[PDB]
């Protein structure tokens, strides 16, 4: 356990701008042999790691030029001259000079882009789910930025609480946007006691709130 300290822990940058990450151990990663074993790994969300730079500076087959490795002693740093959408993910440095191997806590790189309002979609329950006795109404916010978004459920114009769950995606690797889903789940009985179901969306990219709704009947 040589202790691997990584910094910063999070870092948002705008496309093209340069970015740097640091990694400081607790003892020379320089082996008696004329080599220092320290690598940099890039991990996309939910995907498997990919080695970017090994032996401190040597790149790796099929890896952009904007990625450079340097530093030494116990103060190594990764540097991206022109960060790009594709570079989103978590970066880690690994020491293989001592024993056992240890990794840094990682550095989450986010891309700062221009504000983008979400497109809002609503989905009524499928007849098959109703048979099972439960009913899920889904509201979708698609390709937006920044991440902060406020969605609220209203049934027959009566604001709701305690009956919905939301989940937000990772930052898109192409447009750097996010998507979010809010799901209102209630019993069939309750779903049948009301008429209008509406999703209300509030986001920095919207001049005025957006409401998508539907009548249980006409649908």
């Amino acid at each position: 356990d040589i202790q691997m300290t990584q910094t910063p822990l999070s870092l948002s940058v705008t496309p093209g701008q340069p970015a740097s990450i640091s990694c400081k151990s607790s003892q020379s990663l320089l082996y008696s042999n004329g080599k220092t074993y320290l690598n940099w790994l890039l991990q996309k969300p939910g995907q498997s790691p990919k080695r970017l730079i090994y032996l401190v500076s040597k790149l790796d087959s099929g890896v952009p030029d904007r990625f450079s490795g340097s530093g030494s002693g116990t103060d190594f740093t990764l540097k991206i001259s022109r960060v790009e959408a594709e570079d989103v993910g978590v970066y880690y440095c690994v020491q293989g000079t001592h024993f056992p191997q240890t990794f840094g806590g990682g550095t989450k790189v986010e891309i700062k882009r221009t504000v983008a309002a979400p497109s809002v979609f609503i989905f009524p329950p499928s007849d098959e789910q109703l048979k099972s006795g439960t009913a899920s109404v889904v509201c979708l916010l698609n390709n937006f930025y920044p991440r902060e978004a406020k969605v609220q459920w209203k049934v027959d114009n009566a604001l709701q609480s305690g009956n919905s769950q939301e989940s937000v995606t990772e930052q898109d690797s192409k447009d750097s946007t996010y998507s979010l889903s809010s799901t209102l789940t209630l019993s069939k009985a309750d779903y049948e006691k009301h008429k209008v179901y509406a999703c209300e969306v509030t986001h920095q990219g919207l001049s005025s709130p957006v409401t998508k709704s539907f009548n249980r009947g006409e649908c």
């Binding site: 074993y37 498997s48 790691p49 191997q101 889904v138 939301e166 889903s181 799901t183």
Partner: protein, 218 residues
């Protein structure tokens, strides 16, 4: 080229043990180290150990000193990892990596330690309608609900449809079961002639489901 295919996700009851395989191909399996790393959900990675298929030499980190045992099978170019006395804290994604410095990684295997019963998902269509059709594009998807444990895989039209697809991280319901959605955006003008099917795969229960998503009057 170099490949590393690991066995699928599985559930194991506390106290039990599990064996994860890692098929190698595209190089000299016997003349190269094979590492096993662990990824704690949301918090960094942990080196577990290595094995040199050549002479079967193995190294372990103090922690998994007696909890993990690494083996290899030259005739099959497969590296195995057994984990005993599994505890709830042992739930994590386990990867295998080629070379002393992890030059190549397997896709990873999520092992969930839990005494909870395994359960395949229910798949409900999120039908396209005027309520899901913005300026020229329509959104549609699948609601994969009530399954345990994670993960579940989603593909559209057997992998042929990947453009504009969003598969959201799962949410944990009160029932202790998981739920998630997968959506896609297509031309609204194509709903009358194109066919959309979500392929849902839940390996922990060898469950596979295909649901056809058709438009709905709304």
């Amino acid at each position: 080229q170099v490949q590393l295919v690991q066995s699928g996700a599985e559930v194991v009851k506390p106290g039990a043990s599990v064996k994860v395989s890692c098929k190698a191909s595209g190089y000299a399996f016997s003349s190269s180290w094979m590492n096993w790393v662990r990824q704690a959900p949301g918090q960094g990675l942990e080196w577990i150990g290595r094995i040199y298929p050549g002479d079967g030499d193995t190294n372990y980190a103090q922690k998994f000193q007696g909890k993990a045992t690494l083996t290899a099978d030259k005739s099959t170019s497969t590296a195995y990892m057994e984990l005993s006395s599994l505890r709830s804290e042992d739930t994590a994604v386990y990867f295998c990596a080629r070379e002393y410095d992890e030059a190549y990684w397997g896709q990873g295997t999520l092992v969930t330690v839990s005494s909870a019963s395994t359960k395949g998902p229910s798949v409900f269509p999120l039908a396209p309608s005027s309520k899901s059709t913005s300026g020229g594009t329509a959104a549609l998807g699948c609601l994969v609900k009530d399954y345990f444990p994670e993960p579940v895989t989603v593909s559209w039209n057997s992998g042929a449809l990947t453009s504009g697809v969003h598969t959201f991280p799962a949410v944990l319901q009160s029932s202790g079961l998981y739920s998630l959605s997968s959506v896609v955006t297509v031309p609204s003008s194509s709903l009358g002639t194109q066919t959309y099917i979500c392929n849902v795969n839940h390996k922990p229960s060898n469950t596979k489901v295909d649901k056809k998503v058709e438009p709905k009057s709304c």
